[PDB]
Amino acid sequence: HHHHHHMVHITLDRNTANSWLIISKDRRQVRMGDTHQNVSDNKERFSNYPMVLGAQRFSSGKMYWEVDVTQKEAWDLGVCRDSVQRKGQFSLSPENGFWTIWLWQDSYEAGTSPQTTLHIQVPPCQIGIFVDYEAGVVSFYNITDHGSLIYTFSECVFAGPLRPFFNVGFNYSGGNAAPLKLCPL
Numbered sequence: 001h002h003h004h005h006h007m008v009h010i011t012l013d014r015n016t017a018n019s020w021l022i023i024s025k026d027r028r029q030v031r032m033g034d035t036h037q038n039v040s041d042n043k044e045r046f047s048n049y050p051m052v053l054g055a056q057r058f059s060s061g062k063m064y065w066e067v068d069v070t071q072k073e074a075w076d077l078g079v080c081r082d083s084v085q086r087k088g089q090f091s092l093s094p095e096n097g098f099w100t101i102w103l104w105q106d107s108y109e110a111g112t113s114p115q116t117t118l119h120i121q122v123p124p125c126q127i128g129i130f131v132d133y134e135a136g137v138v139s140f141y142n143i144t145d146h147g148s149l150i151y152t153f154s155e156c157v158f159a160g161p162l163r164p165f166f167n168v169g170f171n172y173s174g175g176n177a178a179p180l181k182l183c184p185l
């Protein structure tokens with residue numbers, strides 16, 4: 001792909017974070033803490049899952065960013081509507097305002113309803129995310145495998161401003177403590 005030139009500097013929004021997340025001083029890394037992180041509750045925080053949004057809102061144009069997923073067993077990445085549900089249980093689907101992929105139990109899947117099996121020969125250590133607002137496209141790229149395409153959502157009905165979306169995953173196993181990191185431009 002040749003999307004790198006639409007690179008945007010993403011930072012994480014602390015106020016949207018689940019209360020167990022630890023966001024770095026530079027707002028470019030997030031990981032699961034082993035306890036509540038001593039913050040007040042608010043209506044923006046994702047309650048049920050270890051999720052956080054980027055601060056940036058996009059309503060037009062082309063945007064690209066990259067995320068490091070090294071040594072994680074589980075995570076979700078993509079974009080979502082600014083107005084997505086924060087409290088209670090929900091599925092990651094375009095009907096609910098999410099355009100995402102994930103790793104879970106040694107398989108990669110796109111967040112369609114129902115979910116779609118992905119075919120990845122080289123397990124990615126860094127993921128590229130491309131959004132074309134006007135075209136209604138969200139695409140995912142395997143940076144470890146020379147930028148190979150992972151998945152394209154097309155005919156997207158965004159229906160609002162978009163925000164970068166992150167889920168560091170549960171760490172029941174003790175094998176998923178590593179952070180998500182926004183990679184340098």
Ligand SMILES: CN(C)C(=O)c1ccc2c(c1)CCCN2
Nearest residue numbers: 018020047048049050170171172
């Ligand atoms: C309990 N452990 C070890 C987890 O991995 C975990 C999973 C989900 C979740 C939380 C923790 C607190 C935030 C809300 N959801």
